[PDB]
Amino acid sequence: SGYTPEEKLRLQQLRELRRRWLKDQELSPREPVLPPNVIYKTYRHSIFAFTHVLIPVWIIHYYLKYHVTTKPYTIVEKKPRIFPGDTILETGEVIPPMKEFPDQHH
Amino acid sequence: FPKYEASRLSSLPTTLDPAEYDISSETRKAQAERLAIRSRLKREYQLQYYDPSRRGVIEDPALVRWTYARSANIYALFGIGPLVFWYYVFKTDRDRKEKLIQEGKLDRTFNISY
Amino acid sequence: AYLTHQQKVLRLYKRALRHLESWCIHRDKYRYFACLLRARFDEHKNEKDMVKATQLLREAEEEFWHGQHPQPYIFPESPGGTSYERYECYKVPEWCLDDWHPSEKAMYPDYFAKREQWKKLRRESWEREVKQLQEETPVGGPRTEALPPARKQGDLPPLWWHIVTRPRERPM
Amino acid sequence: MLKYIIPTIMLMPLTWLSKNNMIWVNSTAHSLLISFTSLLLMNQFGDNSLNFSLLFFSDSLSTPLLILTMWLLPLMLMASQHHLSKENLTRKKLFITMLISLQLFLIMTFTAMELILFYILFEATLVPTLIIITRWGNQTERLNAGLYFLFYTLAGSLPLLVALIYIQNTVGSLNFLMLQYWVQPVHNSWSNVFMWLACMMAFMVKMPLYGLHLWLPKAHVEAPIAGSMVLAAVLLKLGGYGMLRITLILNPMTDFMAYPFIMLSLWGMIMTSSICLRQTDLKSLIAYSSVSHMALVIVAILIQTPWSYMGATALMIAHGLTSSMLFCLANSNYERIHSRTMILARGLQTLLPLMATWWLLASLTNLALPPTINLIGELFVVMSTFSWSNITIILMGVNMVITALYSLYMLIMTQRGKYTYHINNISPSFTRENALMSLHILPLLLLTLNPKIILGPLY
Amino acid sequence: FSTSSQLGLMMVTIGINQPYLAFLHICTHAFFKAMLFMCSGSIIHSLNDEQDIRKMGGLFKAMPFTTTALIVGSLALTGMPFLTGFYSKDLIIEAANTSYTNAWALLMTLIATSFTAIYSTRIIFFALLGQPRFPTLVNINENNPLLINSIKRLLIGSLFAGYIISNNIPPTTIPQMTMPYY
Amino acid sequence: APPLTLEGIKDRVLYVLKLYDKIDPEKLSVNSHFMKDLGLDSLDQVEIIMAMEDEFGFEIPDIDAEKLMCPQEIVDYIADKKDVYE
Amino acid sequence: AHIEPRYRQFPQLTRSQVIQAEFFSATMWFWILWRFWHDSDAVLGHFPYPDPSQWTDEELGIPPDDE
Amino acid sequence: SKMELPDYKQWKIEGTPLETVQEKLAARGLRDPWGRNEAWRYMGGFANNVSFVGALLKGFKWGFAAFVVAIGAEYYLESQK
Amino acid sequence: ITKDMLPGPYPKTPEERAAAAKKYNMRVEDYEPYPDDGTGYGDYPKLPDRSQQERDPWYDWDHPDLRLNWGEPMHWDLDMYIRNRVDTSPTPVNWNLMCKHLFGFVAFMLFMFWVGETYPAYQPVGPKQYPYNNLYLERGGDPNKEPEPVVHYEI
Amino acid sequence: GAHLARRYLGDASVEPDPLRMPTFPPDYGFPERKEREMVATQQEMNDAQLVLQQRDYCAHYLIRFLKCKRDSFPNFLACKHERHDWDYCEHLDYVKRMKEFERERRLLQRKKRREQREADMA
Amino acid sequence: MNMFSSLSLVTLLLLTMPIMMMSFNTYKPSNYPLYVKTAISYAFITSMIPTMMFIHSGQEL
């Protein structure tokens, strides 16, 4: 089968041009011509913590403390679970223990 | 081997087609004629595509004919048929619902958004 | 089909081997069956009755269709492969560089100097390329899509720009 | 309303007496100031509307339409000044004069307290629109598009005029405030059936109702960009606004007269969305998209619930900004490839990366991505229409599926894939074109932060 | 397809009225599934964008760290006792077959559990064991610290995360712990 | 993947041919016609292309493959597709 | 770069990848083994399953057949 | 060339599964002419790959050693405490 | 383009077929109009309903993504047959057999899910017992009514 | 279990129905059954915010465990004994339900024999 | 509740600042991927404080 002599010759000619074109896509040394250990890492994470955590949490806390929680039913807590023998901080009340267990065991 | 059975959405493979074989001088003369048309059109396209000073669009008359033929026939699932079908579904549904509301048998205990 | 009988058998052979390779997976296993399959083709290689040879081919195609792998291996960048056309979104045509702002062209003073030479070469060669095709195309238009080579020295092959300057396969 | 009517008229002397090279600068600069002052219309009260005088009033339904109308004039001048750049100077001023006269009629249409005053201004919009399409359209079929637009509208308006004059005769007034207190129920009779049809069929044509929609794709395909922006953004809304006001005096007959028109809208929205999947013309796809979106508004207005009027109000504003944006986006391509065929120029995200972001944002609003006002409006109509009949959720749900399909298909066809090899004149997006899209999308997205001002009087 | 299979198991857990087991499986599945996809990415990258398993093999020693994470991931997925996936999948199956439930649904969930071992062996057997089947120019490299650290953290989760979470969440049901050995 | 070079492609193209038992590794040269010089037939040429496909990890279509008749033609074909200009 | 590619040969490895892989594979097996020793009931069952037939009619309150 | 190709003479089918295939084809009168091109996959560091059980047991030798020590360390403390 | 190069009415005569084919860049033998029946096709050629995915992927098309050449007649439903939409390429299995096996699998699965519902699995265990009258008050029971007590005994 | 095989594929009238049992009076065959005692009061389960399904006859062991869980934070490996106590109670509660099923089965066996004996002797 | 509620929101707010900087374009694309990776790693830590509170006293709000 193979290339005919004209088919072969044309590929040879486009080959020379294509490879010269690809060679011309290379950048010269000056191009592009732009216009005019732990101590460093610790600083880099100190700034990120401050700007991305401390400042946001300062803003959130001020927002939640003085604008959100001053409105009714904006933040609603599931009331704390009380267990037998607990003591209420608000009223100093003691919750009675549970009654004596039948005391099966294994 | 179980023969291939062709559907609308599953066409017959070329390798299983008796036409593709049994070459006839007329079929080759038909194939050679189609290639001539394709090469004539390819040359016509290439002489504009490769022109150094052409900046624009190579208007394709085949694409113009296609859109023109598609946009022309401006004017089942397109008549009274679908409309009447849906008329009775909603009329029947809303008639039953209205009767239940009047008979107090429809629960709207907390329905106050409409 | 445009393909000769000789071309049809070869395409089946390559197709049959590839689907056989999908079934076997293991190379030693594939080698054993690949040689058995080559034997089947070698058996009728010298058949001289083109009605029998044509029959042998058609039956072979039917057997391949029954035995083909439902999920044959595809090279990642071949049509249907998992990387086919993956990079087309990074291929930008070269004419886009004409619209660059001067400040953008100033960062590559040497690339854009070479680019102008190619554009000059394209402008100077075009008229000869058009003439060469006109005086080689038979009356009525071309009969095939094959294009000629350049004949004279200092002539470029007709219709070369979009072949030579096409984007790289890994443009970015 | 004279604090807006007079400044709008002053745009005419300003344009005509401006230096030759400054017509586009001066008109755009001062039309934006008028748009700025239009925010004073938002002094709305819970109970009473804003009734300036015997002629004009504003409530929560007309205010967002008034602000949309005046915002659109500066956007149409930006969209227009390119393809008119070679036009004769005087003909440039007349083109701008037609846009100014259209704003003038429109702001008076939305504030007229008298329905017959509304009708005259409602019907006066035809003249500038028809002139824009037929004079500054670019194709042969702009003449037929003019006639279809003209005679579809008049076919419905002339019955409307007779019905309104009849109503003033028997009620004594057509003042909208008066009609709120003196309205009487409409009883069943063939006479009242035709009074109902006359009062509504003029508005159904402008929406347009499916079945009467075929004038709209014709007009869009043939109109210049500015004609398409006003037509899609505001002129379609005239029908919706008219139906929201006129249905007050059609009860309770609207209970059963609505049925055929709800069926046309419920089925029509599914078919028009499906048609959008096979459209080959980009402008024609967006036109059929409006028919699908406006069918929701017809259904919402006809079922007459507090949630359906809030939804319909939001839909009209949201669709106005979205449809206008989509037309401008397709025009930016057309100014390059000079064709409306959607499949002609592909893979444009590669060549125009920022314009591909505008295309994405516009498509997302078209398919109503939460929490855009496009979804808020669409959702409220779905919630209320479900109450009207649960089965409608199927048609509503299907339409959202199809709406997603063609919105992203239009995005994928033109912006993704491989670029068309032979199209080599895709110049970088101009600052004018980028600013035009940002002026559609930014206000549209900002309204999510405060959507109550586009939810109408039932909010 | 493993993820679809696992999502079905979560939906089964919803069906047998075990919302919290379904949630625990979401959390545990998150660790080893995301690791398997990253282990696969390590292989695909090293074999020049090759994804077909038929052209892999012999990677057990060539990619030691990828191999370790891929075995841990496959064992976690299949419900090896005391890895991250055991603390949800094992509970779910016991709940399903000690419940008033559709018998066909139960059987199909057990057969699918068996299939999970089959296609996990399939990836391990063809990707890692045997002789190499990839092209000749060997570019296997998996020594980037970003690749190692990212998989290393998910490897640790795939081991202990199930244990850590199962011991810290409050109880919200009566876990059925009395049943026949079989 | 690491880049290719013209001499690298030629080295590997011959390397594969040198591991084929129907070719004489001594008679082999970049310009040997697989048919005229090496005595191979159409069926062996197909297998050679498949071996080069497996070597470089990409497919050569049958329309292009049948024309590659000497090792140099294969080398030239690969370089064109991989944009190798060395 | 730090790992030169090879041709038709086993690839080059660093020590760290081999050591780390071996360490984490052992960590898996220590963790599995340690847990058996402490939580073997999670795999075998926490409580015995009674045989329901070993219960007497007296226990279950089944009265005699006659009355 | 930076790169170097290993000498092609070393790729032989003997002692590998490729040899076994040759006898089977030999009994049929056939030969496998690409066998050497496949040989590298069965040689050098690619020979003697672990089995499936061997793979699953990777790390068992030292995981077991640490477990035996840990339980003994626990066994001591309980006896004291 | 000139009006003579646009589509027209259904061709009637052999010369109206000959001229239509030339307009569409087709052989007259290969040209076939859609059957005349007022649907509105006109003289547009009826091309095989084949997806664009079925065309040669290696041929150098003018539009590689659409696999179309410049100037060739576009199928009436080309937008339905782009590579993103309807595909008609041959399947390794027969279409009818795929439908039988897929439906049969679904029909069988639904049958056995029904059998499972009719004959559920469960453990040999009595109903779970809750104190305080089946937790009458905890489950929102009205306290003013006194519920009939639920009594549980040891065993 | 085998119980399903006996019921569906065997005789169903002598196998308990899980949805309806018990189908016999609580006292039948039992002279003086003692009522189960509930250690935890309703208020204790309310304050503990136990899930309603967890408010069964073992809820006092659950409350004790939950309290010990809160107090031993962050030691999440505490409460070994408390967790087991609750788990073990739930086992005995399940075993009681196993006895109920067997009692129901055996009574049905007795019934059928009674019906058979009063059938053949008719 | 002040620490619980405040910290459960900064987790969500922290994930958005990288988005705001890209959109507001006052960032530095020198190593944006590392910036986004760092933001997740901090957001993970801030989300552990609310989780421990839930594990401890069952707190929910």
Ligand SMILES: CCCCCCCCCCCCO[C@@H]1O[C@H](CO)[C@@H](O[C@H]2O[C@H](CO)[C@@H](O)[C@H](O)[C@H]2O)[C@H](O)[C@H]1O
């Ligand atoms: C449905 C509610 C409202 C309906 C109102 C309908 C009233 C008629 C409005 C359009 C009037 C247009 O009047 C005339 O119509 C025909 C087609 O319609 C157009 O003519 C066009 O169509 C005809 C036939 O369809 C062709 O023969 C002709 O070549 C073409 O130009 C004319 O160019 C237009 O001037």
Ligand SMILES: CCCCCCCCCCCCO[C@@H]1O[C@H](CO)[C@@H](O[C@H]2O[C@H](CO)[C@@H](O)[C@H](O)[C@H]2O)[C@H](O)[C@H]1O
């Ligand atoms: C877009 C198309 C929309 C189509 C909508 C079709 C709606 C059909 C409405 C039918 C109702 C017409 O109105 C109905 O007819 C007549 C008025 O002449 C009234 O009845 C009156 O005339 C009839 C004459 O037959 C007498 O029998 C009756 O004694 C008298 O009271 C009915 O009490 C009234 O309910």
Ligand SMILES: CCCCCCCCCCCCO[C@@H]1O[C@H](CO)[C@@H](O[C@H]2O[C@H](CO)[C@@H](O)[C@H](O)[C@H]2O)[C@H](O)[C@H]1O
């Ligand atoms: C409490 C958690 C459990 C703690 C126990 C931790 C496990 C011990 C950590 C060190 C693991 C080192 O593991 C050991 O490393 C060497 C170094 O490669 C491996 O050795 C392997 O590579 C080297 C280099 O070729 C050669 O010794 C040998 O060819 C090969 O077998 C051993 O096969 C492996 O057993």
Ligand SMILES: CCCCCCCCCCCCO[C@@H]1O[C@H](CO)[C@@H](O[C@H]2O[C@H](CO)[C@@H](O)[C@H](O)[C@H]2O)[C@H](O)[C@H]1O
């Ligand atoms: C625990 C297992 C869970 C999964 C269980 C899945 C079971 C699903 C069983 C579905 C069976 C349906 O598939 C069934 O197969 C046979 C085998 O060809 C088909 O048979 C078909 O093939 C050949 C011809 O092509 C002929 O036998 C027959 O004429 C034809 O109908 C049936 O037409 C089809 O109904």
Ligand SMILES: *C(=O)CCCCCCCCCCCCC
């Ligand atoms: C009976 O108790 C109902 C159980 C429902 C099906 C569970 C499947 C267990 C089969 C037992 C054989 C052992 C094979 C692991």
